[PDB]
Structures are given as C-alpha cells and as structure tokens.
C-alpha cells in the first residue's frame, strides 16, 4: 500500500537520523501523510514497526551479500570484501545506533528480545561461513569459528559505526583492520 | 554551585536516562531555574557533554593507576581492553550515553565536541603502541591509523556483544587482543 511502504521509509530515515526514542510515532504519522490508525492497523505498535524494518533490512543486506560474495574467489577475499561492503551498504549497518538503543531498552522483555537474537544470528552467520570455508580449503586454522565470527562481526560493526567522513579513508582503515585480523589468525 | 545542577543531572540521567530527563526536572530538584541553566550550559546536550568530560577525567585517573600494573605495553593493551569491557558493564551512565550518542552523533556542534572526547580514549592506544615501538615490543608504521582501528573495534565488541555471561565476554575480548597483536607482528 502507498500508505504502508510510505510509513516504512519515513520511519527508516528518522530512526537513522534521530535514533529510536527521539523518533515519535506522531512525526512519522506526520511526514507520511497518514493516521495513527493506519500505523496501528499495519504495525500495531511503534516497537513492532521497528522490528519489521529490521526484518526487511536484514533480508536486503542478506541478498546484497548473496550476490556480492561471488566476486571474491578465496574466503580471505570474501572477508575483506564483506567488511568493505558494510561500509558502503545502505542496509542494516546504518541503523546500528538505533538497534543498540532499542536492544538495551527492551532486552528484558524476552518476547522481542528473542526476535533480535534471531536477527543477530544471521548477521553473524555470514562470518561463520567465511571462516568455516576458509578452514576447509586450508586458508587458516580456527578451532573456535563461533568465537572468531562474533569477534570479527562486532569489531567490524565498531569500525563502521564509530569511525561526514571521507569514504575512501574509511575503506583504507577497514582494509588495514582486515589485514591485521587475518594475519593474526595465522 | 553549578556543581549542584551537574550532580543531580547525572543521577536523573542514570535513573531515567537522557531523553526522559527534562531540563525542568533538573531545575526543580536542584533549587535552580531554567534561566540559570541556559546561562551555565546553554542547552541540555551541552550539560550532558559537561558531565562526560568530568567522567573522562575520572577514567584517566583509573587508567593512570591501573596501568602501572602492566609491565610491558603488550600487557597494557590487554589490560586496557578488558578494563573497558568490565568497567562499562556495570557503569550506570552507559545507557544514558547510549541514547545521547545515538541522538547527537549527527550535529556539527555536538559532533565536534563528541569526537574530541572519543579521541582522548583513542589516544590511550596511541601511547601504548608508540611506547611499544620504542620498547622493541613491535613495529608499527602508522600508529594513528592503528590506534583508531583498535579503539573502534574494541568499542564494537564492548557495544554490540548481545551475548550474556560476563565470563565469556572477557574470553572473546582477550582472544581479540591476542589476534590483533598477533597480526601487528
Ligand atoms: C562509553 C564511553 N567510551 C567511548 C565512547 C562511546 C560513545 C561516545 C563517546 C565515548 C569510547 C569510544 C571509542 N570510540 C573508543 C573507546 C571508548 C571507551 C573506552 C573505554 C571506556 N570506559 C569508555 C569508552
């Protein structure tokens, strides 16, 4: 509906620019020329709207990587390439601040917390594959891929989120990191 | 004095967070007025930044003290990372800082002042690596880039690790430290 995807996009950008709390359902309903009833009928609650957006963001990113990893022969390159993509992509990573702001608040309520761990698993799994495969084709030796994946992901999210900033300078930084990390596995 | 408003402000931010905390509450509980506040700290965000600075100073003190127990710079690195994780695990202001950051991490006035604050945390890393270069523990050409990489990555691990059990968090953080220094060699 031109009244469904209409509110989804407005919510996305707002959550990206002002975070979760600052973004009120009212303003969303405002800039998206709709009613509190529409938002309600389509998303019920504000927190529900946010999880749906995270659900979509997770898919897009998943698809984008699914078709981008092919361009990298060795997993060592898929590592470099994945980290660089997370810098330029428009999916998921641009919403980290809001995600953490949301996670910390409703982490007690296990209802939606469970939902986020599910979204948290996929975003991590990407690294799992890279390292698991790297083991199979003898590119490196990692006894605990689960630990290395978690470390890599969060470490990277850190560079992406905490580092306007010159897009080229960021990539050189991300590559440097990528190099240092992989040479540490060896 | 102006210390009264700051004291109360931190408590409210700790208790109810940054967004829920209004300048009004800070006013009445401090026996002051919105006027005297606008005078001393201009805006709310500026007050919160004034509290973070003071906090940073306390952090420097903690580091200044704790760091003397790490003989080599390679040990300081491990220590600094683990200490960030644990200290921030039970640090009250954490949630309030999370909100503020995710809110004003895109404001020319507050961003410049924010980066200046984060840079002091990053600079700790600059010392360790520079000292390490001299002390023959390693050899890093661009310390500035490497310190930013270490700092933001460590912060990532500390911030996005949605996993529980503090025992596991320290393990992963120690592992990162090993992996990271192992790659600088
Ligand atoms: C929680 C404060 N804080 C921030 C920080 C995060 C967001 C805004 C400002 C500073 C930080 C930011 C970067 N990049 C690197 C290290 C730290 C850090 C390190 C230790 C600590 N004990 C607090 C730390």
Author numbering:
A (entry chain B): 1 to 163, 165 to 187
B (entry chain A): 3 to 187
Question: What did the authors write?
Answer:
A member of the TetR family of transcriptional regulators, QacR is a dimer composed of nine alpha helices in which helices α1-3 comprise the helix-turn-helix (HTH) containing DNA-binding domain connected via helix α4 to helices α5-α9, which form the dimerization and multidrug-binding domain. QacR represses transcription of the qacA multidrug efflux transporter gene by binding as a pair of dimers to the IR1 DNA operator sequence, a large inverted repeat that overlaps the qacA promoter (PqacA). Drug binding occurs with a stoichiometry of one drug per QacR dimer and elicits a coil-to-helix transition of residues T89 through Y93 in the ligand-bound subunit resulting in the expulsion of Y92 and Y93 from the interior of the protein and the formation of the multidrug-binding pocket. The QacR multidrug-binding pocket contains two distinct but partially overlapping binding sites designated the rhodamine 6G (R6G) and ethidium (Et) sites after their respectively bound drugs.
Structures of QacR(E90Q) and QacR(E120Q) bound to Et, Dq, MG and R6G were solved to 2.8 Å, 3.3 Å, 2.2 Å and 2.9 Å resolution, or 3.3 Å, 2.9 Å, 2.4 Å and 3.2 Å resolution respectively. By contrast, QacR(E90Q) and QacR(E120Q) in complex with Et and MG crystallized in the hexagonal space group P62. Structural comparison of the hexagonal QacR mutant-drug complexes with the corresponding tetragonal wt QacR-drug complex revealed a new QacR conformation (with global RMSDs of ∼2.0 Å between all corresponding Cα atoms) in which notably, residues 89 through 93 had undergone the coil-to-helix transition, the structural hallmark of drug-mediated induction. Thus, the hexagonal form of QacR exhibits a closer approach of the DNA-binding domains, and therefore the recognition helices, with their centre-to-centre distance now 39.1 Å compared with 46.4 Å for the tetragonal conformer. Although charge neutralization of Et was ascribed solely to E120 in the wt QacR-drug complex, the location of Et in the QacR(E90Q)-Et structure is dramatically altered. In this QacR(E90Q)-Et complex, Et is angled at 120° relative to its wt orientation and shifted toward the R6G sub-pocket, hence overlapping the Et and R6G sub-pockets and taking a position that is comparable to that occupied by MG. Lost are van der Waals contacts with the side chains of I99 and I100 and aromatic stacking interactions with F162′ and Y103, the latter residue shifting from a position that would have clashed with Et in the QacR(E90Q)-Et structure. Nevertheless, Et gains stacking interactions with W61 and van der Waals contacts with S86, M116 and N154. Indeed, in the QacR(E90Q)-Et structure, the side chain of E120, despite remaining within 4 Å of the Et phenanthridinium ring system, is repositioned to avoid a clash with the drug, shifting by 3.0 Å so that it is no longer available to charge complement the Et N5 nitrogen atom (E120-N5 distance  = 4.0 Å in the wt QacR-Et complex and 7.0 Å in the QacR(E90Q)-Et complex).
